[PDB]
Amino acid sequence: AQYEDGKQYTTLEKPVAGAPQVLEFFSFFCPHCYQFEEVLHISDNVKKKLPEGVKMTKYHVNFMGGDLGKDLTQAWAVAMALGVEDKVTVPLFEGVQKTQTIRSASDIRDVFINAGIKGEEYDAAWNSFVVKSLVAQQEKAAADVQLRGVPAMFVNGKYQLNPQGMDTSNMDVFVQQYADTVKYLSEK
């Protein structure tokens, strides 16, 4: 076929029931993830080609960056809880991979402060059990698909995107192939 298993995507041997329709994993330490966000805008371009009524979920992972890695998973839960993902994603990426200004939990907190989240509000969220179970959800979702690499996208818990099998000579053409693949998988 034009879309073949093993080419634009692979199929999970052990399908995940009740998974989100589109499920993305990333790390703020992950170089391709930086690209996916800042240069490619994968998520936005996928969303634009997705059917009406499909929810899109994005989770952070712990297995890169040691202690700071877990702090970022907790901070991403704070972002999700407060709905401020779009305000902190870029400064977190640049602070980790570009400017080397994120070295502690307090430096992560600074990004949120600078973004306009109030100190009180961040600290309350950070310590909240709502944020605790959002951290749990992130860990268990990675567990459900037995993840060990990012960036990764899963469609209805059965199909994993395989960007290595797409053309990469043109950034825009790559993105469209990626998004058109998600749309195809979505309609499978």
Cα distance from N-terminal residue to C-terminal residue, the chain: 14
In this structure, is the dihedral angle defined by the CA atoms of residues 14, 159, 2 and 36, taken in order, positive or negative?
negative
Question: Residue 187 is part of which domain span?
Answer: 1-188
Tokens at 98, concatenated:
């570009």
Tokens at 117, concatenated:
């989240």
Resolution of this entry in Å?
1.9
Number of domains in the chain: 1
Residue 18 belongs to a domain with what CATH number?
Answer: 3.40.30.10
Q: Is 72 exposed, middle or buried (0-12, 13-18, 19+ CB in 10 A)?
A: buried
Which has the closest alpha carbon to 20: 145, 147, 176?
145
102 Cβ neighbours under 8 A, 6+ residues apart: 68, 92, 95, 96, 108, 111
Give the integer Cα–Cα distance in Å for 44 and 50.
10
Looking at residue 51, the DSSP 8-state letter turns out to be: P
Cβ–Cβ < 8 Å for 109, 44:
no
DSSP calls for 124-182 = HHHH-HHHHHHHHHHHHHHHHTT--SSSEEEETTTEEE-GGGS--SSHHHHHHHHHHHH
